[PDB]
Amino acid sequence: YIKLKVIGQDSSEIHFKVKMTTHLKKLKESYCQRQGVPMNSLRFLFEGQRIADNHTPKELGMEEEDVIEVYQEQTGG
């Protein structure tokens, strides 16, 4: 279990506590729900790497209080 700070371009900082082996797609779902933004309209980055759905914190080498960056390619819909 590690806490992750999820940052967006809109200065949004939402924290999530996840297990080291859960697929990071669940964190995308919790960001979609807590922000009311469609999940398919967001890109999640760890370092300079787009976070895949089967990627896990253990695989990406994430640690406590690491930061994930979120981009929204749909400027209008």
Binding site: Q33, G36, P38, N40, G77
Partner: protein, 156 residues
């Protein structure tokens, strides 16, 4: 100039043949004359859906580039629906000139496409935060709100 002629052709066709329960009438100007650029419409709820019993009025606004350009459809008052802006504006692929809009699309085809949109929302492109949240979390609460607003707009 061509818009007013196309809109007048549509008004006559709607009078003669139009789907049951729908309304589509041009508004009036402050001087009483007819304004074919602003229509007051109404879309009836489908039986068997949480929308049944309610008549949801919306407004169609036409620009001078009609029918080369699509009309702007705004629900008045704004509807609780995941694809309706908090301002009432309805987005649909046929209502985006850079998408699926063609000049042949009549008023009848737009009101039917919005009617279908009510019970079958496009969850991939939500335009309202509140209805997209409730629909993707507590569907029972979503239905209760729709039925509450269906009874709110029921023809009394």
């Amino acid at each position: 100039g061509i818009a007013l002629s196309r809109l007048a052709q549509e008004r006559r066709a709607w009078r003669k043949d139009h789907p049951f329960g729908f309304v589509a009438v041009p508004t009036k100007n402050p001087d009483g004359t007819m304004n074919l650029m602003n229509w007051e419409c109404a879309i009836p709820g489908k039986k068997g859906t949480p929308w049944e019993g309610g008549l949801f009025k919306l407004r169609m606004l036409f620009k001078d580039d009609y029918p080369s350009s699509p009309p702007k459809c705004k629900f008045e008052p704004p509807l609780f629906h995941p694809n309706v802006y908090p301002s009432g504006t309805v987005c649909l692929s046929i209502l985006e000139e850079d998408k699926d809009w063609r000049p042949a699309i009549t008023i009848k085809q737009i009101l039917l496409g919005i009617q279908e949109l009510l019970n079958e929302p496009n969850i991939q492109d939500p335009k309202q935060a509140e209805a997209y949240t409730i629909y993707c979390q507590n569907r029972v609460e979503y239905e209760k709100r729709v039925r509450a607003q269906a009874k709110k707009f029921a023809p009394s």
